[PDB]
């Protein structure tokens, strides 16, 4: 008899079905940051990695596996075939084309659509009940694309949206005030990136309205120039990209935070990208970041934030731009 | 009055001395894996990053800072000047030279020595009471170098040594037996890399000696070829390097495990590289991996593993090789 | 419209089926220690508490609920009706009768049987696929009882058995050696309590056999009297009971450790009580503690520990005693 | 040579100085709930327990020690002599007299003063640099007493105050709205207990003011009777006490949350009891709960919450009552 059979008496042939499985698609810096963050928060009993570059994929998988002693996620697998993703509760999509210099936004989105036309039906085939969390940029449009291709109901297709931007906002707020960002409250909503909307009316510490204490907050008459905070939020990513080449750690952490609300059914509120038609005067199928209640069924509820006519106007303009692109897309 | 002063009443101007500070030197893939692993285990109240490449350094720092909302380490700093490292309890060195094409080993090692002649006195100046953890390769030699340059007592200079190799060994063992590596015990000792020694006599599950059940275990007559496991331990790292270009996650996790024993004064036993002269038959000032008890004073105690004459012979040969290299070095 | 409906837009009416639910039966000190340990390790998305004393039950539930802000288990429920336990993955039984003055052991055990005849079919009705973890004393016998009543296969009925005794053993060993118990290995097997068997041959640090270094280890000629360690393992529990009235924290922590292996499918090895007929020379349907691999299907595999004829004799004597009691029982 | 000395080579005689030590005074249900919560959050490298009932104290200590394998706090000690508390960073006081039926508030406070006159100088003697966290009831007065006796500056004497009441408020808010309490914001301030002040103006989700959406919020004209939420907060403890005899778990969790901000220097904002003279028109040395920034030096800063004249009036009346008692105290 083998050493194993001398040492160990087997009771069960186990038809291994994963109970809390997560898949990350794309093993670039973003995908791997998501993976390590997920592994270190014990959110999954099985982690699957998928990418088209087989050697890099295998290398990342093995590197993680070699750290198993220090983790509590007993199964880490990878493959270019989507059968490795079967029965995932949550599938995180980070794959996508990188925008070349002089490439139009439309062209970039169409390249990503061509990628998603392959990824999404494969994901859906093997995990028809999963939640989709889209991290790939441009996230609002790509969440829309994932939604269109998957045929999933809207509660189950979520874009990372302005979750990280809101985290950055709160970090900068905390630095200005000398308070941990957990205790600084403020929301960045709408379209991820330059057009996002900082909701000044909601910024507070301990329930104290900053806008109330300082009525010129976020305006051009503001002597403390709080507008810059938002400008910094918008530009931070660029700066990080200018400095180290890309951004990864912060995105990975924010994505793991989302994953945690979903996998643990927390019903926390996160600013994520969701199908917003019928709100704020928006009449098209577009996805924008609003505060959403996240749980085991994805987005169950939305918070209705009261906005100024100017803030609503920004949202509508974003919706118009997004739709102007989306209607050109070939599925 | 400013918004801050309308919102916040200050009681104290605080000369904040960090109480649980860790420094990582080198922000390549290894250093950043160490940093993220440390941040996600809440081991430090302040993390300092140091490197000579300033833009990359700043970018990595900012990327981590942007995730502050999701972390419990309130201060992350960086700089090329070592004054940012002041008052660290633990300093982790991952920096080192990369071997150029056609450069001899002695030359490469000498370049690392010259680098350490700058790094180490700077580290010691600002944190004279710290523990030094050397991760840079070749790790046994560079740990010797750090020890010589720092003038620290030997309990406070630790090389990562065979900690990860032992973790890999336990992973592979776990895969062969169908058991989590936490419950599979086995030690890889001696010189990190090709010359390491798998201590077959200690391999066990639930205290059951595998060698006793299978006396040919690890020999050439072993029909199950357990030798291959050790071979894979040695080679897997090369494989990962061939597949993805480098290794990072597993080393980061194992280093964070070491850091955890040190920062929490756990007195767990880890196979790390220590100045082993006067034990195990070793007669030169060399560092080799043995099981060490790690706590807040670094290595306070060593486990004396009973070895066969053949295992002892391998350790002595490693010591002779290491000393043969070290005596060529100029300090 | 209500405030909620002005604030929140609902997308979904959710039939929420909990995905990682745990039930604790009995809210005495042991049950509540288990509950708090489970809540602080984030093992469950729903925790159900059950007991016959309704006011105490409700109070404990509310007290836990009031700490929800500090926890990551979004649903805590309680009730005397077992419908609150529906769809549990793991059900932990701590309930049992207390021996009255002048009541025989057989009588006490029979009362526990009669209690289990109510509890177990109710548990099974609402969670037919759960794992049962029996903590109630006398644990080997009551685990047998739960197994008989439930009709579950043996992989799914687990007694806490000698898990805590082994933890205590490793603590005492750690105290003697100056090493954390995580790095001190030793197994207490067989019948929980006075008759348990310390397996001296497996006691080790870093794979170094203590028995090999010290052949008299655990015998009567042992000048260091390591036997006393086992004695203390047996007696410490009495001592704690004499000192504070009962024991709770350590058992709660050890049970949460078991739960963690089960809920996360870890396949770690734990010394738990399992139906051991056909192994270790045992010929009756009795439960004894051996090292078991624990995962999502309960006990999937057992480690076959090499024992001396004397150790085997002790196990057989325990089996005969247990069967001698069990055959008097009426189901 | 002993087995230990054969197995282990000692490098260091360690003058053991704790780096992150916490003391809990009082091992009643509250003290032990604090202790288990602290142990499970890895906030201390050493935990000291102190109480006057020696057998109960020893029993609790041993019970915790037996769970060491499952914890990462390597030293747990206890004693009636305060020398066991030496060099604590944080000392949590839960000891105190229990109010008898018909005992006046003044008489109860004086009994507690007599207890504190023994406890506090002993604590201060052995840990002159510690932060004091007073949990004993009535907490506002006893924090004042601890402050007077210790001679500590006010940043270093903190009362648990309305931290738990605010947590309960947020729990109830979450239940009314279907949102996790982490995402529900609301503050209970002032005097702990019936006279506490729910700050309706600050209640919000995602920065959306509930008071703005529902102007009658918290008034007698409120058709949804949100006032009841506060009444429930006030009464919850009584109910829990009526049901199970006392309250423990929630307090333990909230206290551990405070301890975490202090031990990790987080600078989070918590509603804790602090010396409030010179604010809200208060002219006496009284302690009330306001939002405080908590870190390694205790309370470094206060948030200035804008209150209505009615809310201020409630605070002033509380201050008057507290002072009316405090001026009768004999030190």
Numbering used by the authors:
A (entry chain A), B (entry chain H), C (entry chain H), D (entry chain A): 1 to 331
How did the manuscript describe this experimental structure?
Lactate dehydrogenase A (LDH-A) is a key enzyme in anaerobic respiration that is predominantly found in skeletal muscle and catalyses the reversible conversion of pyruvate to lactate in the presence of NADH. LDH-A is overexpressed in many tumours and has therefore emerged as an attractive target for anticancer drug discovery. Mechanistically, LDH follows an ordered sequential mechanism whereby NADH binding to the cofactor-binding site precedes binding of pyruvate to the substrate-binding site; this is followed by a conformational change in which the active-site loop (residues 96–111 in hLDH) closes over the active site to provide a largely desolvated ternary complex. In humans, lactate dehydrogenase (hLDH) occurs as homotetramers or heterotetramers predominantly comprising subunits encoded by the LDH-A (or LDH-M, muscle) and LDH-B (or LDH-H, heart) genes that assemble to form hLDH-1 (B4), hLDH-2 (AB3), hLDH-3 (A2B2), hLDH-4 (A3B) and hLDH-5 (A4).
